[PDB]
Design an enzyme around this catalytic site. Structure first.
Site, mmCIF file in Angstrom:
data_model
loop_
_atom_site.group_PDB
_atom_site.id
_atom_site.type_symbol
_atom_site.label_atom_id
_atom_site.label_comp_id
_atom_site.label_asym_id
_atom_site.label_seq_id
_atom_site.Cartn_x
_atom_site.Cartn_y
_atom_site.Cartn_z
ATOM 1 C CB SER A 154 -1.959 14.162 -13.596
ATOM 2 O OG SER A 154 -2.336 13.888 -14.929
ATOM 3 C CG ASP A 209 -1.813 1.188 1.293
ATOM 4 O OD1 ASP A 209 -1.913 1.901 0.275
ATOM 5 O OD2 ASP A 209 -2.439 1.391 2.360
#
Length: 330
Positions: free
Chosen positions: A199, A35
């Site tokens: 992004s 994770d």
């Protein structure tokens, strides 16, 4: 040193991925959910409330000659999906894919929430976010990667998750045969303890690319792709019959649909998520309403590049002094 371990979807939907981890002496192998959005290595154990164990493999520290109670240390964690666990702490030897860390904090669960009990395939979590998020008190503990870093050939790990197939976590090296083209690296902020990056935009299907900054986290422990409501609405508007359902808890779409791809930007590069990766199947057995793999982050507080996005790429988690993320197509 290096390590290399195969990671395997827990079910036919890629709801999560499990990676075998050797703990203790002699080894006890548990299948952990790696994770990159949390920083605790915790396991089902001989200390877990018996009614909360339902098929998991347990770590038994009393059977490990290298286990030592970390006296006074406790932990307690709550995850974005509302699940939680807590317990006490041992140190022990932990190996992943041939890479060994001695003295790793192994957080032994005394209590786990129902969603953990109900998932017999996940024996615990191995956190790979920054150690500043580790919940051990009163002495915060380091992640497996942080402990291994100095010994690694290069201070990196990579995630290469499969679509409906196994993939690989590598530590200490970049497998140049595992991706196509070049790896595009992008800046990371560690201010929230995550692999947080920006992004450069998105496209839906064959549509034009929209240049827009989307801050979010690379999180292998989250199944879906969670993005701003504007972006998610633009995606689902291209699917006839798709709608946001408050009763189901997100966007659903007709199972008869063919889903468009979704592209996200990494610098000037582009990662394409095929439409099929966005199908999470019937909302309930036999339903013709299917659950979408791109959902709004509006109720989270952060955008999450979870498995739906990451499995479309070869992803480098660069733990150099200034961390960065790398993405390549594959």
């Amino acid at each position: 040193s290096t390590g290399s371990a195969t990671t395997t979807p827990i079910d036919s939907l890629d709801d999560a991925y499990i990676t075998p981890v050797q703990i203790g002496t002699p080894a006890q192998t548990l299948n952990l959910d790696f994770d990159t959005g949390s920083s605790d290595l915790w396991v089902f154990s001989s200390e877990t409330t018996a009614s909360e164990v339902d098929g998991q493999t347990i770590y038994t520290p009393s059977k490990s000659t290298t286990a030592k109670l970390l006296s006074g240390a406790t932990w307690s964690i709550s995850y974005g999906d509302g699940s939680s666990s807590s317990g006490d702490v041992y140190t022990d030897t932990v190996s992943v894919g041939g890479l060994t860390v001695t003295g790793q904090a192994v957080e032994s669960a005394k209590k786990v929430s129902s969603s953990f009990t109900e998932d017999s395939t996940i024996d615990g979590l191995l956190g790979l976010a920054f150690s500043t998020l580790n919940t051990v008190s009163p002495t915060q503990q380091k992640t497996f990667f942080d402990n291994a870093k100095a010994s690694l050939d290069s201070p990196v790990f990579t995630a290469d998750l499969g679509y409906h197939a196994p993939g690989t976590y590598n530590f200490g090296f970049i497998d140049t045969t595992a991706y196509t083209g070049s790896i595009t690296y992008t800046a990371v902020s560690t201010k929230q303890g995550f692999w947080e990056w920006t992004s450069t935009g998105y496209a839906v299907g064959s549509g034009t690319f929209k240049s827009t900054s989307i801050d979010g986290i690379a999180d292998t422990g989250t199944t879906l792709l969670y993005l701003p409501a504007t972006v998610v609405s633009a995606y689902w508007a291209q699917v006839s019959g798709a709608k946001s359902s408050s009763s189901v808890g997100g966007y659903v779409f007709p199972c008869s649909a063919t889903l468009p791809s979704f592209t996200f930007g990494v610098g000037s590069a582009r990662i394409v998520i095929p439409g099929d990766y966005i199908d999470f199947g019937p909302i309930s057995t036999g339903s013709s309403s299917c659950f979408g793999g791109i959902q709004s982050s509006a109720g989270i507080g952060i955008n999450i590049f979870g498995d739906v996005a990451l499995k479309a790429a070869f992803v480098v988690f660069n733990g150099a002094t200034t961390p960065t993320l790398g993405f390549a197509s594959k």
